[PDB]
Amino acid sequence: KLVRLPGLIDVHVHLREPGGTHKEDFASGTAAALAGGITMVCAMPNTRPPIIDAPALALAQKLAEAGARCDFALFLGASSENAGTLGTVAGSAAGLKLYLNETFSELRLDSVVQWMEHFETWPSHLPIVAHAEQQTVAAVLMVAQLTQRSVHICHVARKEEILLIKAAKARGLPVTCEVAPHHLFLSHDDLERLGPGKGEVRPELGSRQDVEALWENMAVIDCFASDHAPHTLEEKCGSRPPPGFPGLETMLPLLLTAVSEGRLSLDDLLQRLHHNPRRIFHLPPQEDTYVEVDLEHEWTIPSHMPFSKAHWTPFEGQKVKGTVRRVVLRGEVAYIDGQVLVPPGYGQDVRKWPQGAVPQLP
Ligand SMILES: O=c1[nH]cc(F)c(=O)[nH]1
Ligand SMILES: [Zn+2]
Ligand SMILES: [Zn+2]
């Protein structure tokens, strides 16, 4: 029989609009979200132009309100120049994103003093999330401690990183983290199939011991989040391949397969794709919204899923069990067995809902 799930939330997607709309756009990316059982997305700021100032945020808001099919919030991006400038618009964003390592990003902050300046100037009650790999996780945690506030670590991929976060949580430090499906379901073993172009992602694919360590430390993982990072196959297979994988349409099917194999419970899944995203990012509930899944249907991931403009997937050939049958978003059928039924522009900026503002002391 079907199982009804609440509206799932992905706090880490790249929708590529503005400036990279051949890779994705709000319409195609949120179509891919609905097809993956996702009714609310938080979109990263590494677009063209990047969302690193009030005018770029206003532009992206309209673009999102016109093209998004599911609901959304938009990240602001930290830059080497905008610390202390974001106070009037900070509350309207999903949170502040820091790029602390090299990746598909023009926003790297090279001095730790720039990190501190952001942690000090960004309103302390609003989320800060970091792309922070290996020792950079410990470095950014230190900055959070010096500035006495929380931090959220994006796509944790390594035994090294999850064990460090585990030690920090055991000392009572306010740190949360997310893990992406490719770091749970792929590894070095797959680089031969993928090749060095397709296989290019940051954080890179881990060893089998990295993958095993994340599964063993499920209790340390607060959120699953796709880091949906679409690029075209041409780009992935070209001279300088940009890192990243598309993932909205495969994330939930992969995770449902793990559930059916007894590797985690349905509750563990709902904690990490609904409750914890809500509470870490202060995201509002979605009225009359739910996802119906079929845990019985077995299928094989094809060479590309229907909706993402990436038109490729590193999970090709994996056998999954579990499929999104229907999604209702705020009282409308949004998706059924491969058909997206709400138009571009149906989706709304949740930070403009009364319940979607982050509460704060006057
Ligand atoms: O972390 C990321 N890697 C690659 C990307 F294209 C992107 O948007 N984000
Ligand atoms: Zn990243
Ligand atoms: Zn990302």
- The domain that holds 222 is classified in CATH as 3.20.20.140
Domain that holds residue 88: 2-348
């097809």: which residue's tokens?
35
Task: Decide if 58 is inside a domain.
Answer: yes
Give the residue, out of 129, 205, 227, 231, with the most ligand 1 atoms within 8 A of its beta carbon, to mutate for a pocket test. 227
Task: Decide if 361 is inside a domain.
Answer: no
Q: Compute the distance from residue 207 Cα to the ligand 2 centre, in Å.
A: 19
CA distance 44 to 33: 15
Task: Decide if 232 is inside a domain.
Answer: yes
């055991």: which residue's tokens?
170
Q: Is the CB of 242 under 6 A from ligand 1?
A: yes
With b meaning 16 or more CB within 10 Å and e meaning fewer, what string describes 31-45? bbbbbbbbbbbbbbb
Task: Decide if 162 is inside a domain.
Answer: yes
Task: Decide if 316 is inside a domain.
Answer: yes
CA distance 60 to 42: 12
Task: Decide if 356 is inside a domain.
Answer: no
Task: Decide if 54 is inside a domain.
Answer: yes
Ligand 1 atom at minimal distance to the Cα of residue 231 = 6
Residue 227 annotated among the catalytic residues of the structure: yes
Ligand nearest to the CA of 246: 1
Who's near 47: CB < 8 A, 6+ residues apart?
15, 16, 17, 18, 19, 20, 60
CA distance 61 to 99: 21
Task: Decide if 304 is inside a domain.
Answer: yes
Q: What is the DSSP string of 3-20?
A: EEEEPEEEEEE---TTT-
Q: Which two tokens stand for residue 227?
A: 């880091």
DSSP letter for 36, please.
T
| Sign of the dihedral through C-alpha 226, 228, 234, 238 | negative
Q: What is the number of domains present in the chain?
A: 1
Question: Residues 10, 227, 337, 349: which is the catalytic one?
Answer: 227
